[PDB]
């Protein structure tokens, strides 16, 4: 019964969090983290505009992740969000599994190429 | 557990007893006066002296242009410095310092007798040096200290 009780406690706790996750995005965690630091702490509609018009490639996926998080908030609160009500309360970028590749170099040498992936997590909340 | 139960107390910023004192340099030798001034700034005349706290007095020196240098040291003592460029060593004298102003000579001497750290860099800022007898430090009521009384 121990693990059942622990799981029930965690399941009750998750009901008050409003978040979305992107897992195994096949792109550089550092370059993704630049975008994350740009939009951390910002009101959601301005963040959507910023991500739509940003000059980084990763902003396109961050925008859809943010839309998913807002939808999760709307479903868990059983109402539509108003104007300027929600803001990006948490965002993080972690590194994920790396694909290893080999690239030929002069004089018969071979060098390793790393194709990196990341995870992104976004929590939204109200500006209370 | 703390098993000492009889400890030596360190003074701190709240419990230090700093005072403003005025000393006269009418006929004193430069190094001999500056050694005692350095003791005053450091706080070695305080029973609650604490080496890691600024616990000494604020010293106002008056009649600083009447300080005395014995021998031929007014022009014969050669101070050397370097600009950091090749061929960049420069010479100067206590006379050059005093012409620039008494406070520059006094600061140059007292630094050198102060500790060489952050505390000494702060402590040197508690020294005020004036050529005449006219200084504006009212509302602090500096007490007059006879420099010859200190040994």
């Amino acid at each position: 019964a121990r693990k059942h009780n622990s799981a029930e406690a965690r399941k009750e706790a998750l009901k008050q969090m409003y978040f979305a996750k992107l897992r195994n995005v096949p792109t550089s965690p550092r370059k993704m983290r630049l975008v994350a630091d740009m939009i951390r702490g910002m009101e959601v509609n301005r963040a959507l505009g910023v991500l739509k018009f940003s000059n980084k490639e990763a902003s396109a996926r961050v925008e859809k992740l943010l839309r998913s998080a807002v939808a999760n908030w709307e479903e868990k609160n059983e109402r539509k969000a108003e104007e300027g009500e929600l803001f990006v309360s948490r965002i993080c970028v972690d590194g994920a599994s790396t694909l290893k590749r080999l690239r030929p170099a002069p004089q018969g040498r071979g060098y390793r190429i790393r194709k990196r992936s990341n995870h992104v997590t976004i929590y939204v909340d109200t500006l209370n | 557990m703390d098993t000492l139960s009889f400890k030596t107390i360190s003074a701190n910023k709240a419990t230090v007893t700093k005072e403003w004192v005025i000393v006269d340099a009418e006929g004193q030798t430069l190094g001999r006066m500056c050694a005692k001034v350095a003791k005053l700034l450091r706080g070695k005349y305080k029973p609650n002296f604490t080496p890691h706290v600024d616990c000494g007095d604020n010293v106002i020196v008056i009649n600083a242009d009447k300080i005395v240098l014995s021998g031929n040291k007014w022009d014969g003592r050669i101070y050397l410095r370097h600009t950091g460029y090749p061929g960049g060593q420069r010479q100067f004298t206590p006379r050059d310092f005093m012409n620039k102003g008494p406070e520059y000579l006094f600061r140059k001497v007292v630094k050198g007798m102060l500790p060489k750290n952050r505390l000494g860099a702060k402590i040197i800022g508690n020294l005020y040096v004036y050529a005449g007898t006219e200084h504006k430090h009212e509302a602090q009521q500096p007490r007059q200290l006879d420099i010859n009384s200190l040994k």
């Binding site: - | 030596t8 107390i9 070695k44 005349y45 305080k46 029973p47 002296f49 080496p51 040994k151």
Partner: protein
């Protein structure tokens, strides 16, 4: 039989690494670097346990010197007079009286002021 002490071998390192918390950079957690740093610190601690006694005696002497000069004497003259009169109060107690009980320090000085 085959014996590999995996858990004990790892536990030794973990116990020592709990002691290197607070160090700078790799010196807190990288193990060869951390274990190197911790032993040099232990040699320092052995030396500094000896040096602490000298430091505190010097501090007491400086405070006694200042209080004696306030009373009119110097440290060397005051201590010579106390030793001649046979007063056995040590420098720690004398410095404590000088800092915190000036009347008691004054009475002590007045005892040997003759």
């Amino acid at each position: 039989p085959r014996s590999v002490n995996h858990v004990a071998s790892r536990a030794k390192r973990k116990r020592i690494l709990k002691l290197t918390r607070g160090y700078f950079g790799a010196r807190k957690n990288v193990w060869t670097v951390a274990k190197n740093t911790w032993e040099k610190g232990l040699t320092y601690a052995y030396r500094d346990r000896k040096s602490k006694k000298r430091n505190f005696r010097a501090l007491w002497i400086q405070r006694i010197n200042a209080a004696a000069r306030l009373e009119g004497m110097s440290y060397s003259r005051l201590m010579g007079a106390l030793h001649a009169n046979g007063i056995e109060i040590n420098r720690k107690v004398l410095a404590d009286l000088a800092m915190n009980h000036p009347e008691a320090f004054r009475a002590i000085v007045a005892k040997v002021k003759n």
